[PDB]
């Protein structure tokens, strides 16, 4: 009900796909859950041109990859190729980002713009991601990240209300 899905956005595999309350799918989004399921958290803002593709078929005899996930208050930036990443709640994904195979994003993370998280890259909680090759830039503040996520959730709710159908 509360989830504002855009008209230009596409959600392939509706049974596999999953959208929590107060969600926001921007225009030209692609939540392709044909092969596997895609779980979106509450108050999660998926920005425009975001390719939400399923990680694996989940039909492998041994060591099948985890399909998709997204914690609450997840600020997914525009043009972000989210694939096979278990995003912890309050994860701030950067613009033009790229998630790897079975990448574990921790709580209160801050992915930089134009980043590339590699396969099986376990990011630590309260830490800014940086570099061309994934690495720890520095420890992030708890109060500043929570305030920015609250402001982003309020702004997305206003755009969710009007001008989309």
């Amino acid at each position: 009900s509360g989830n504002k899905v855009s008209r230009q956005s596409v959600l392939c595999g509706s049974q596999n796909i999953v959208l929590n309350g107060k969600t926001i799918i921007m225009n030209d989004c692609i939540i392709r859950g044909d092969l596997a399921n895609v779980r979106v958290g509450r108050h999660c803002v998926v920005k425009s041109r975001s390719v939400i593709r399923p990680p694996f078929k989940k039909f492998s005899k041994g060591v099948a990859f985890f399909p998709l996930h997204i914690g609450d208050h997840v600020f997914i930036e525009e043009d972000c190729v989210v694939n096979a990443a278990q995003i912890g709640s309050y994860v701030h994904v950067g613009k033009n980002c790229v998630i790897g195979r079975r990448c574990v994003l921790k709580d209160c993370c801050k992915i930089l713009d134009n980043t590339v998280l590699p396969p099986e890259t376990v990011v630590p909680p309260f830490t800014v991601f940086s570099g061309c090759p994934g690495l720890f830039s520095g420890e992030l503040p708890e109060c500043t990240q929570e305030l920015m996520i609250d402001v982003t959730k309020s702004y997305y709710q206003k755009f969710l209300p009007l001008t989309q159908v």
């Binding site: 595999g13 044909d34 092969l35 694996f56 078929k57 039909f59």
Partner: peptide, 10 residues
């Protein structure tokens, strides 16, 4: 090919 076959089957 196995992933595409599973996607085609779905």
């Amino acid at each position: 090919h196995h992933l595409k076959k599973t996607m085609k089957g779905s």
